[PDB]
Amino acid sequence: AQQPVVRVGEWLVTPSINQISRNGRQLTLEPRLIDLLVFFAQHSGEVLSRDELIDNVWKRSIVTNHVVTQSISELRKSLKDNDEDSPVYIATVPKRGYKLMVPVIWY
Ligand SMILES: [Zn+2]
Ligand SMILES: [Zn+2]
Ligand SMILES: [Zn+2]
Ligand SMILES: [Zn+2]
Ligand SMILES: [Zn+2]
């Protein structure tokens, strides 16, 4: 039985099984997305450039600037989980990149 390592906003994250979870809602994500989410949480409330995200989350793969942007949309979509009352988790900072806007608790 697996312990969450971190809480991002309303979601407990358990990277060992690629899972996020919220109040009786469990979701498995792709591992790269977990890795992106974990990177944001380690650098929370910091502006992260497309470049920082590529270097750290896509290590030893080349990707386009555009893979990042579509990964970001997929992660926003999973973090929202169809709840229109959800905060913004990942905010776009114009011309600069992205910032994780929710509280993080490490366990
Ligand atoms: Zn940091
Ligand atoms: Zn940082
Ligand atoms: Zn993609
Ligand atoms: Zn993806
Ligand atoms: Zn996908």
Numbering used by the authors: 1 to 107
Task: Show passages lifted from the paper.
One system used by E. coli is the Cad-system, that consists of the cytosolic protein CadA and the membrane proteins CadB and CadC. The pH-receptor CadC senses a drop of the external pH and activates transcription of cadBA below pH 6.64, 5. ToxR-like receptors are characterized by a conserved modular composition: external signals are sensed by a periplasmic sensor domain and are transduced through a single transmembrane helix to a cytoplasmic DBD of an OmpR type, which acts as effector domain to regulate gene expression.
To characterize the CadC effector domain and the interaction with DNA, we first determined the crystal structure of the CadC DBD (amino acids 1–107) at 2.0 Å resolution. Thus, CadC comprises a recognition helix (α3) and a β-hairpin wing (β5-loop-β6) within a compact fold with the topology β1-β2-β3-β4-α1-α2-α3-β5-β6-β7. To our knowledge, the CadC DBD represents the first structure of a ToxR-like DBD. A unique feature of the CadC DBD is an additional short β-strand (β7) that extends the highly conserved C-terminal β-sheet (β1-β4) in OmpR-type DBDs. The additional strand β7 is important for the structural integrity of CadC, as a truncated variant (CadC1-102) was less soluble and unstable. The highest structural similarity of CadC1-107 with an effector domain bound to DNA is found with PhoB. While SAXS data of CadC1-107 alone are in excellent agreement with the crystal structure (χ2 of 0.98), analysis of the CadC1-107 41-mer Cad1 DNA complex indicates the presence of two domains bound to the cadBA promoter DNA. We have recently shown that the CadC DBD is not per se dimeric. This is confirmed by the monomeric state of the DBD in the crystal and in solution as evidenced by our NMR and SAXS data.
